[PDB]
RNA sequence: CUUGUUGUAUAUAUUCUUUUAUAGGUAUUAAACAACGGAGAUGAGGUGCGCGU
DNA sequence: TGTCTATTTAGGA
DNA sequence: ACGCGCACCTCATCTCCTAAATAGACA
């Protein structure tokens, strides 16, 4: 279908971050006013008004005045059972008439049709399409029982219905034959639905009537669709525009319609569409109308859509295997058993335990593990208990989390010197991967001391707590996000959180290939353990009451007092030898940070985006993804 | 225009950074592999801090 | 006026 | 754990990537 490229303007272009500021302050104005008005006019009187005012006989009018539209709320223009053109042009039209998003023309002088109507209301009307046809007014899924409430009924009613759309009776029953027809169907599950389709008769005035007012009630919480202060990002729609290779070069010059006159705009080449490539004859034939601009790190990009499918290449089945996700001791575990069988893969704990070096520092339950994996085809020696020895510097296992990485760039230098390409990216991401989520677990916990130490500084004083209106301004006027501190740190962060994506997709690759050129057809991967942060100082004075108790005799859940017995809290003590507050020692300190060093590469090495990574890489690989 | 973005050097120098220290910044040298459907919005989860239980 | 750019309208029955 | 705020991050879901005809601008 689709595709994307992106391309880099060489040169000076008139398209600055001031031409994008303007453009998304009329995106916000339209959206503000739209959401306004989702319900205080109707379709009907929008049609009325652009029928009186300018007379003309289109179809634009004649489907906003007749009985199905005439009198229903303005935000069914977004659903769709109504044509997409007619809600366009209609609300376009209704808008322009009255100048009700304030457009006073934009700086280039660029067409209006191309960055007003084609442009950011195209935009603000897509984006409130899917707020609509994805709203789920508030509901659930339930077995339906005999001996079941009348609110039972109806929620498995309404909650198929808006699964599917249907409305008319006929549509119950087309949902009906559509799993029957198919073979084996579930003969229980299609009666749960014929039972309500038998209810949608009855009352269907309360069943139409109660979803619409809910749906009304999920549109005046809405505060509408909002494009950040963060975008950097406009689309014009042009129908007539040309895209032309330069002469005694590689790159294009793009020829955009602007103050009536064609400006060029001068592209670098892509090595992505280049010179006598199939895929450039695509894009210079295909080419689609919308055209993208956005400023990443102070440069322009222009992005470019066209169509383009390649021809899928099978090969005879062979192999099916399963891929597991694991956060232990390695990523990646596959069900084969390692024979040397595989080319190009490197076994790398089967490479650990070679060296005297590293298994005299490990006990008899380790080394059994170890060997355990060792038979196992894995990938990513990512071993978090002795990664977090290069945080904590007293932990037992600071000196084999030094063996580990000192025989492991060993390891990457060999690989490099015999000119092993593959399996040397491999190793070298699997080392930075290590390193940079160390790198990104400090500039994290940096973020969280830098933010308490400013909002302990700062000093919010809140009269009530109960609503915004009644806190301290400050808590919006002047953010922690908003300091110059923030910003540095979160630029950091997202570089290593770029090293990290880059990393994890070399490894996923390494994989991928491996599989892909061993025969292998399918790799089907097959679809967690938080550990526990001790309870905060606050917590555990405001929440489990160690404030004023007894510190001979505590009474609080046994959590706390195993918590308690292990040296995790120092209690500081009254004049009754009571607790009037708390601290973390050294032990309890670093416990912390080992359950949020655990914790935070769940959340941070996108786990839940490897089978996308892998899906991706099917789409143009000898091997399938089957979802298990 | 040996041309776009991103990853991959435990390279040379540094009176740089503990807010990327087995890594980065500032300047160089050195590449060859690889991935590349984007933009926008909404919703749901999780998380940190602060103020109250 | 001729040519090139911008604006309009698109239905479901 | 709960509430109110301010943020941050990863996921899922959806829309959209047209085209002919007419009107207008200006030499
Ligand atoms: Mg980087
Ligand atoms: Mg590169
Ligand atoms: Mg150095």
Request: charged share 30%; net charge neutral; proline share 1%.
């Amino acid at each position: 279908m689709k595709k994307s490229i992106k391309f880099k303007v060489k040169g000076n272009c008139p398209i600055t971050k001031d031409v994008i500021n303007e453009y998304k302050e009329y995106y916000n104005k339209c959206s503000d006013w739209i959401k306004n008005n989702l319900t205080s006019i109707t379709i009907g009187e929008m049609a009325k008004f652009l029928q009186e005012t300018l007379g003309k006989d289109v179809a634009y009018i004649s489907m906003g005045l007749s009985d199905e539209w005439k009198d229903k709320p303005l935000y069914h223009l977004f659903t769709k059972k109504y044509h997409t053109n007619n809600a366009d042009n209609l609300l376009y039209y209704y808008i322009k008439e009255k100048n009700l998003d304030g457009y006073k023309g934009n700086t280039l002088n660029i067409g209006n049709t191309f960055f007003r109507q084609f442009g950011y209301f195209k935009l603000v009307v897509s984006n409130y399409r899917t707020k609509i046809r994805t709203l789920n007014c508030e509901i659930k899924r339930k077995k339906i029982d005999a001996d079941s409430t009348s609110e039972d009924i109806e929620m498995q009613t309404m909650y198929e219905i808006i699964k599917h759309n249907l409305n008319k009776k006929t549509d119950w029953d087309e949902f009906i034959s559509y799993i029957e027809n198919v073979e084996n169907p579930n003969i229980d599950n299609i009666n749960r639905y014929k039972l309500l389709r038998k209810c949608f008769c009855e009352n269907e005035n309360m069943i139409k009537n109660k979803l619409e007012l809910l749906s009304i009630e999920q549109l005046k919480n809405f505060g509408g669709c909002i494009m950040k202060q963060h975008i950097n990002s406009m689309t014009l729609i042009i129908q007539h525009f040309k895209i032309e290779e330069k002469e005694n070069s590689l790159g294009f010059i793009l020829n955009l319609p602007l103050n009536k006159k064609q400006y060029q705009i001068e592209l670098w080449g892509n090595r992505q569409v280049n010179k006598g490539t199939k895929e450039r004859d695509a894009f210079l034939n295909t080419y689609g109308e919308n055209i993208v601009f956005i400023i990443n790190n102070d440069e322009l990009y222009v992005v470019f859509s066209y169509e383009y499918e390649l021809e899928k290449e099978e090969a005879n089945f062979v192999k099916t295997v399963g891929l597991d996700v694991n956060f232990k001791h390695a990523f990646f575990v596959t069900s084969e058993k390692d024979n040397c069988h595989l080319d190009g893969y490197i076994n790398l704990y089967k490479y650990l335990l070679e060296h005297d070096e590293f298994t005299n520092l490990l006990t008899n339950d380790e080394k059994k593990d170890y060997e355990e994996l060792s038979k196992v085809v894995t990938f990513c020696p990512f071993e978090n208990q002795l990664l977090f020895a290069r945080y904590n510097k007293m932990s037992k296992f600071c000196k084999k989390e030094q063996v580990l990485s000192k025989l492991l760039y060993a390891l990457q230098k060999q690989l490099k010197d015999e000119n092993r390409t593959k399996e040397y990216i491999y190793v070298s991401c699997v080392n930075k991967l290590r390193a940079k989520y160390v790198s990104y677990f400090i500039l994290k916990e940096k973020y969280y001391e830098k933010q308490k130490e400013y909002d302990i500084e700062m000093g919010f004083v809140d009269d009530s707590t109960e609503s915004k209106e009644s806190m301290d301004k400050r808590r919006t006027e002047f953010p922690f996000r908003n300091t110059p501190v923030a910003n540095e740190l979160l630029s950091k962060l997202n570089n290593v959180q770029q090293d990290i994506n880059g990393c994890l997709k070399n490894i996923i690759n390494y994989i991928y290939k491996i599989f892909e050129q061993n025969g292998y057809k399918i790799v089907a991967l097959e679809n967690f353990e938080k550990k526990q942060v001790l309870p905060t100082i606050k917590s555990l004075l405001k929440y489990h009451k160690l404030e004023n108790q007894n510190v001979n005799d505590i009474k609080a859940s046994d959590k706390v007092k195993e918590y308690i017995e292990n040296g995790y809290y120092e209690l500081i003590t009254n004049e009754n030898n009571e607790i009037v507050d708390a601290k973390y020692t050294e032990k309890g300190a670093m416990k912390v940070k080992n359950a949020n060093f655990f914790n935070l590469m769940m959340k941070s090495l996108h786990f839940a985006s490897v089978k996308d990574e892998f899906v991706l890489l099917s789409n143009n690989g000898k091997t399938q993804i089957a979802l298990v």
